[PDB]
Design a protein around this motif. Sequence first.
Motif, PDB file in Angstrom:
ATOM      1  N   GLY A  20       0.800  -1.229   0.000  1.00 45.75           N
ATOM      2  CA  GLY A  20       0.000   0.000   0.000  1.00 45.75           C
ATOM      3  C   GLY A  20       0.838   1.287   0.000  1.00 45.75           C
ATOM      4  N   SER A  21       2.177   1.146   0.077  1.00 42.73           N
ATOM      5  CA  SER A  21       3.110   2.312   0.012  1.00 42.73           C
ATOM      6  C   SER A  21       3.316   2.880  -1.394  1.00 42.73           C
ATOM      7  N   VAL A  22       2.217   3.066  -2.107  1.00 43.36           N
ATOM      8  CA  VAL A  22       2.151   3.832  -3.361  1.00 43.36           C
ATOM      9  C   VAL A  22       1.699   5.234  -2.909  1.00 43.36           C
ATOM     10  N   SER A  23       2.538   6.230  -3.213  1.00 45.79           N
ATOM     11  CA  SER A  23       2.493   7.515  -2.532  1.00 45.79           C
ATOM     12  C   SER A  23       1.198   8.286  -2.770  1.00 45.79           C
ATOM     13  N   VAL A  24       0.508   8.003  -3.872  1.00 45.78           N
ATOM     14  CA  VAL A  24      -0.744   8.668  -4.167  1.00 45.78           C
ATOM     15  C   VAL A  24      -1.889   8.165  -3.254  1.00 45.78           C
ATOM     16  N   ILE A  25      -1.716   6.993  -2.616  1.00 48.05           N
ATOM     17  CA  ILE A  25      -2.833   6.399  -1.862  1.00 48.05           C
ATOM     18  C   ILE A  25      -2.797   6.801  -0.388  1.00 48.05           C
ATOM     19  N   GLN A  26      -3.938   7.286   0.107  1.00 48.09           N
ATOM     20  CA  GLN A  26      -4.152   7.480   1.555  1.00 48.09           C
ATOM     21  C   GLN A  26      -5.505   6.931   1.936  1.00 48.09           C
ATOM     22  N   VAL A  27      -5.586   6.428   3.175  1.00 51.21           N
ATOM     23  CA  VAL A  27      -6.835   5.932   3.750  1.00 51.21           C
ATOM     24  C   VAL A  27      -7.250   6.910   4.886  1.00 51.21           C
ATOM     25  N   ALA A  28      -8.417   7.540   4.753  1.00 49.68           N
ATOM     26  CA  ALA A  28      -8.950   8.349   5.854  1.00 49.68           C
ATOM     27  C   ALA A  28      -9.850   7.497   6.789  1.00 49.68           C
ATOM     28  N   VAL A  29      -9.514   7.516   8.071  1.00 45.40           N
ATOM     29  CA  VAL A  29     -10.210   6.742   9.075  1.00 45.40           C
ATOM     30  C   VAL A  29     -10.893   7.737   9.984  1.00 45.40           C
ATOM     31  N   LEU A  30     -12.211   7.742   9.948  1.00 40.97           N
ATOM     32  CA  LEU A  30     -13.030   8.742  10.670  1.00 40.97           C
ATOM     33  C   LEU A  30     -13.480   8.043  11.940  1.00 40.97           C
ATOM     34  N   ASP A  31     -12.860   8.417  13.074  1.00 36.66           N
ATOM     35  CA  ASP A  31     -12.995   7.648  14.304  1.00 36.66           C
ATOM     36  C   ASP A  31     -12.688   8.504  15.559  1.00 36.66           C
ATOM     37  N   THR A  32     -12.306   7.854  16.664  1.00 35.72           N
ATOM     38  CA  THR A  32     -12.072   8.554  17.953  1.00 35.72           C
ATOM     39  C   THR A  32     -10.697   9.284  18.004  1.00 35.72           C
ATOM     40  N   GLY A  33      -9.918   9.200  16.931  1.00 36.92           N
ATOM     41  CA  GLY A  33      -8.592   9.816  16.928  1.00 36.92           C
ATOM     42  C   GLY A  33      -7.539   8.744  16.815  1.00 36.92           C
ATOM     43  N   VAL A  34      -6.270   9.122  16.932  1.00 34.05           N
ATOM     44  CA  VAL A  34      -5.208   8.119  16.864  1.00 34.05           C
ATOM     45  C   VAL A  34      -4.131   8.441  17.866  1.00 34.05           C
ATOM     46  N   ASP A  35      -3.540   7.382  18.406  1.00 32.01           N
ATOM     47  CA  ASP A  35      -2.276   7.462  19.150  1.00 32.01           C
ATOM     48  C   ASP A  35      -1.127   7.704  18.159  1.00 32.01           C
ATOM     49  N   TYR A  36      -0.910   8.983  17.851  1.00 33.84           N
ATOM     50  CA  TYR A  36      -0.130   9.383  16.664  1.00 33.84           C
ATOM     51  C   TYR A  36       1.352   9.010  16.706  1.00 33.84           C
ATOM     52  N   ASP A  37       1.894   8.805  17.911  1.00 36.17           N
ATOM     53  CA  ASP A  37       3.308   8.428  18.043  1.00 36.17           C
ATOM     54  C   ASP A  37       3.502   6.959  18.438  1.00 36.17           C
ATOM     55  N   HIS A  38       2.455   6.151  18.274  1.00 37.39           N
ATOM     56  CA  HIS A  38       2.542   4.739  18.624  1.00 37.39           C
ATOM     57  C   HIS A  38       3.647   4.170  17.736  1.00 37.39           C
ATOM     58  N   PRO A  39       4.633   3.481  18.324  1.00 35.85           N
ATOM     59  CA  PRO A  39       5.759   3.039  17.493  1.00 35.85           C
ATOM     60  C   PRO A  39       5.367   2.161  16.316  1.00 35.85           C
ATOM     61  N   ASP A  40       4.258   1.414  16.454  1.00 38.00           N
ATOM     62  CA  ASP A  40       3.784   0.535  15.380  1.00 38.00           C
ATOM     63  C   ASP A  40       2.862   1.220  14.376  1.00 38.00           C
ATOM     64  N   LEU A  41       2.685   2.528  14.524  1.00 34.69           N
ATOM     65  CA  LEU A  41       1.793   3.309  13.670  1.00 34.69           C
ATOM     66  C   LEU A  41       2.473   4.546  13.057  1.00 34.69           C
ATOM     67  N   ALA A  42       3.343   5.190  13.825  1.00 38.03           N
ATOM     68  CA  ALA A  42       3.680   6.603  13.591  1.00 38.03           C
ATOM     69  C   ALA A  42       4.077   6.964  12.125  1.00 38.03           C
ATOM     70  N   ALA A  43       4.983   6.182  11.554  1.00 34.46           N
ATOM     71  CA  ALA A  43       5.510   6.440  10.231  1.00 34.46           C
ATOM     72  C   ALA A  43       4.440   6.406   9.152  1.00 34.46           C
ATOM     73  N   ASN A  44       3.324   5.700   9.387  1.00 33.02           N
ATOM     74  CA  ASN A  44       2.187   5.698   8.429  1.00 33.02           C
ATOM     75  C   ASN A  44       1.171   6.835   8.678  1.00 33.02           C
ATOM     76  N   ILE A  45       1.283   7.541   9.797  1.00 38.54           N
ATOM     77  CA  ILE A  45       0.352   8.635  10.074  1.00 38.54           C
ATOM     78  C   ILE A  45       0.727   9.914   9.296  1.00 38.54           C
ATOM     79  N   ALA A  46      -0.017  10.161   8.218  1.00 36.03           N
ATOM     80  CA  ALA A  46       0.245  11.256   7.299  1.00 36.03           C
ATOM     81  C   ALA A  46      -0.460  12.530   7.751  1.00 36.03           C
ATOM     82  N   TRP A  47      -1.560  12.381   8.493  1.00 40.55           N
ATOM     83  CA  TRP A  47      -2.333  13.540   8.947  1.00 40.55           C
ATOM     84  C   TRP A  47      -3.223  13.136  10.087  1.00 40.55           C
TER      85      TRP A  47
END
Length: 318
Positions: free
Chosen positions: A24-51
């Motif tokens: 899924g690391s094709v740069s044009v693609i993003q997934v918007a997840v409309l939810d309670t928010g995100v733990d933005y610095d979670h080590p298993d997440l952070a690098a994929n958090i674009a916004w």
Amino acid sequence: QPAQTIPWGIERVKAPSVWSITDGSVSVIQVAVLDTGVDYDHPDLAANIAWCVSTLRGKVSTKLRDCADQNGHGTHVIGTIAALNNDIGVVGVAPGVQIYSVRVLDARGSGSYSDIAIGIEQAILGPDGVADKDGDGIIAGDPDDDAAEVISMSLGGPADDSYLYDMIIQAYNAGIVIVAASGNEGAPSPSYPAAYPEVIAVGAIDSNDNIASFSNRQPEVSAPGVDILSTYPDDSYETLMGTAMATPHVSGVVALIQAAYYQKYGKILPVGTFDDISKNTVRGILHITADDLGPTGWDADYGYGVVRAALAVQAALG
Ligand SMILES: [Ca+2]
Ligand SMILES: [Ca+2]
Ligand SMILES: [Ca+2]
Ligand SMILES: [Ca+2]
Ligand SMILES: [Ca+2]
Ligand SMILES: [Ca+2]
Ligand SMILES: [Ca+2]
């Protein structure tokens, strides 16, 4: 941090054998997840958090504290789509996909309809706040824009709000695939927004391939929704169940289809419709490559069946 494990649902939807084509690391693609928010610095997440954005109480804010997950639900859903493939924690269906975390739900997991409506608008406009910045008429699948290609909504209710529905129509017609939980009341039909014809309603299976009894009926497809391990605040891991957990599996498979199709053709597929059974749109490919459980064909338990990323991608590229 604990050593990486693959949650059973990631294997169930046939995601790992796709990663050599694309994670899924094709740069044009993003997934918007409309939810309670995100733990933005979670080590298993952070690098994929674009916004990381919030639309709570009418205000669009990217203040970290405003956008952070105060519930846990959003971080869990997002880790099912895109937890990184590395030495720790878990791994998502699309472990290289860019994520937009759009907080439309408060610390309790409640949201108003205009907050969710605004969230949908944000997914279209993207971090730069402009829909079609280069004026070429293309939004989703345009590397000159930053619109999401998938909007994932692990939320729902009996209420049908026309303002939110209008935002959904706008995203759909922009070429954005919309995915949402069918709901958890064992009801005869999906909650909204899943029940919109523009939206892919997702039901929940367990590890025995049984439909979960709380899964609202008449979904479009189904996916792992019981004993789902994923990321959780703070830098942690937790196990949840619900059609909210099944939804991100389907959003991940959609991200893989569009990433693989773009990597090969320089463009994305149209969203398609519920009735589509051709290999010419995202939804047509989902329907015909799904593992058809229950009665032959679409059924009120499984919908078209259990999504399978390896076959979806093969169909998209052939
Ligand atoms: Ca994009
Ligand atoms: Ca954290
Ligand atoms: Ca990981
Ligand atoms: Ca934009
Ligand atoms: Ca454009
Ligand atoms: Ca362009
Ligand atoms: Ca069936």
